[PDB]
């Protein structure tokens with residue numbers, strides 16, 4: 286029927302898109318990865334030769350460094366750290382900066398995610414719908430001062446998304462002393478609920494315990510961006526769902 | 528109105544849930560984190576004292592080890608690695624095992640995610656609807672051999688989810704030599720599109736290049752679990768959306 290043809294076309298398009306993306310990523314990153322691996326191997330070989338580090342102790346040092354990486358940013362299991370972890374869990378971001386080490390803790394986290402994901406999704410959908418209604422009312426008032434089409438709403442939403450991304454990138458560049466492009470990429474990754482974890486905020490000089498205002502601003506910005514993303518998805522994506 | 532009261536109640540419930548989760552996580556993980564940090568500091572101090580490692584070179588060693596961690600699993604930017612990265616990107620998992628190192632690569636990844644997320648969501652929704660229809664038909668045929676209620680469908684979906692999770696956990700425990708509970712936790716994390724990245728498959732002894740069958744099975748299992756999760760969300764969660 287129509288549904289079978291539609292889903293077959295969707296599957297074929299998804300497979301072709303995946304193949305094209307994999308080919309482009311390989312062709313763009315193979316040489317860079319090879320050069321980085323060669324440089325790292327040369328550096329580690331030189332360091333091992335200079336310090337005469339035993340092979341057996343090298344694995345222990347690597348394990349210790351890997352396990353102590355989250356602890357180098359301070360205490361990640363305080364009230365602020367626990368709140369950040371809960372926010373990441375409920376939003377399905379998965380930064381990976383801190384993970385439970387207890388089986389009971391893992392089970393509690395699983396139950397927490399199960400009981401919290403639908404509630405967060407419903408709240409985000411409602412907030413996005415309310416924001417869309419408010420934006421439509423504001424646009425109508427502006428037009429009266431100076432009917433609304435779907436293209437105008439789409440353009441307004443895209444402009445709002447771009448402005449929010451630019452504001453977040455500028456704020457993160459000013460706070461964490463990051464590059465503008467890097468801050469923009471990190472903001473885009475955070476707002477898409479992907480969570481690569483390469484760039485994690487509130488992980489420098491113990492900012493989670495000495496800068497409550499920065500933490501509050503980051504939480505507010507994350508919530509606002511998530512609401513904007515949900516509103517945009519409702520405006521453009523949810524229409525093709527049912 | 529009703530919508531304002533509903534969204535205010537949702538926000539209050541979400542805030543209370545976040546506070547409770549943060550309090551429980553802190554009370555459960557503070558002592559464990561303190562003990563782990565103390566043990567790691569003692570071990571690193573002992574190693575530094577034994578090897579007389581200079582403080583300046585310690586930072587260089589830490590940076591080299593952190594940068595070379597993905598490369599220890601083999602070549603992560605081959606065809607299989609690029610396909611895995613694209614699959615993680617389109618599914619918003621964000622494992623974080625491999626990340627782009629080029630600005631052009633980052634921009635391409637951002638555009639890829641933007642152009643692929645709605646398509647993947649639509650395909651998953653259609654596949655979940657088709658699976659729900661097939662399950663309803665199978666249940667009707669079974670009942671005839673031996674009308675259907677919503678509670679029966681919910682129970683069948685929950686049982687299917689539990690069976691899929693158990694099968695995935697058993698397969699991952701048999702393949703990667705992981706614990707049953709750890710495999711179950713990793714499967715749950717992967718199927719919820721959260722992606723902590725603590726446990727990543729296809730990262731041992733170069734399995735991405737020597738075991739094509741294992742990679743294909745992992746891809747099929749991930750797709751099947753994502754389809755099951757989408758079908759369950761459509762059955763129980765999507766009803767409260769609109």
Ligand SMILES: CC(C)CCC[C@@H](C)[C@H]1CC[C@H]2[C@@H]3CC=C4C[C@@H](OC(=O)CCC(=O)O)CC[C@]4(C)[C@H]3CC[C@]12C
Pocket residue numbers: 287290291294295298521522525641642645646649
């Ligand atoms: C800025 C961002 C949010 C843009 C997102 C783009 C989407 C609006 C596009 C991208 C992929 C598109 C889909 C790609 C393939 C198809 C299959 C297509 O089916 C057919 O052509 C056969 C069945 C029929 O005749 O309807 C129906 C539209 C649909 C779901 C498309 C709907 C619109 C989608 C989701």
Ligand SMILES: CC(C)CCC[C@@H](C)[C@H]1CC[C@H]2[C@@H]3CC=C4C[C@@H](OC(=O)CCC(=O)O)CC[C@]4(C)[C@H]3CC[C@]12C
Pocket residue numbers: 456460496498499502
């Ligand atoms: C309507 C649009 C166009 C503009 C929105 C206003 C912004 C320009 C404001 C609103 C909130 C502000 C932020 C609120 C809180 C903080 C934390 C603040 O941090 C501290 O005070 C402690 C750390 C330090 O000493 O820098 C630094 C500024 C910043 C990011 C502010 C930067 C400027 C922001 C983004």
Ligand SMILES: CC(C)CCC[C@@H](C)[C@H]1CC[C@H]2[C@@H]3CC=C4C[C@@H](OC(=O)CCC(=O)O)CC[C@]4(C)[C@H]3CC[C@]12C
Pocket residue numbers: 364365368493494495497498500501504
């Ligand atoms: C309807 C909307 C606008 C409600 C918004 C609520 C915010 C005003 C609240 C919710 C969560 C709060 C945060 C939750 C946790 C913390 C950690 C907390 O840190 C500590 O308790 C330890 C460090 C210290 O002693 O300050 C400082 C306040 C802060 C950032 C809070 C600041 C105020 C926040 C952002």
Ligand SMILES: CC(C)CCC[C@@H](C)[C@H]1CC[C@H]2[C@@H]3CC=C4C[C@@H](OC(=O)CCC(=O)O)CC[C@]4(C)[C@H]3CC[C@]12C
Pocket residue numbers: 399400403404407529532533536537540763767
């Ligand atoms: C195993 C998993 C799939 C469980 C998923 C649980 C959901 C089915 C629950 C969890 C939170 C619930 C929501 C929590 C709060 C509210 C607000 C509530 O609104 C009111 O009480 C005021 C308005 C009115 O009177 O209807 C309406 C139901 C709703 C959306 C609930 C609908 C059902 C939800 C999404």
Ligand SMILES: CC(C)CCC[C@@H](C)[C@H]1CC[C@H]2[C@@H]3CC=C4C[C@@H](OC(=O)CCC(=O)O)CC[C@]4(C)[C@H]3CC[C@]12C
Pocket residue numbers: 694698702738740741744
């Ligand atoms: C209907 C339900 C109840 C059962 C579904 C059947 C499973 C028991 C089968 C179907 C697919 C099978 C998997 C397909 C592919 C592989 C890869 C295979 O790996 C290799 O052959 C190479 C690595 C090695 O040497 O172990 C190991 C078995 C495994 C996980 C299989 C384990 C058994 C599985 C999960």
Ligand SMILES: CC(C)CCC[C@@H](C)[C@H]1CC[C@H]2[C@@H]3CC=C4C[C@@H](OC(=O)CCC(=O)O)CC[C@]4(C)[C@H]3CC[C@]12C
Pocket residue numbers: 606607610735736737739740742743746
């Ligand atoms: C309608 C549904 C059932 C379609 C299912 C398609 C699968 C049969 C395809 C899609 C993606 C394929 C995989 C894409 C990439 C790779 C990596 C590839 O590895 C290499 O090319 C290098 C190593 C080697 O030389 O084998 C081996 C095959 C494999 C696992 C493929 C196996 C077959 C897969 C799972």
Ligand SMILES: [K+]
Pocket residue numbers: 378379380479480481620621622721722723
């Ligand atoms: K993630």
Ligand SMILES: [K+]
Pocket residue numbers: 380381382481482622623624723724
């Ligand atoms: K990570």
Ligand SMILES: [K+]
Pocket residue numbers: 376377378477478479618619620719720721
């Ligand atoms: K996600």
Ligand SMILES: [K+]
Pocket residue numbers: 379380381480481482621622623722723724
């Ligand atoms: K991650």
Ligand SMILES: [K+]
Pocket residue numbers: 377378379478479480619620621720721722
């Ligand atoms: K994620």
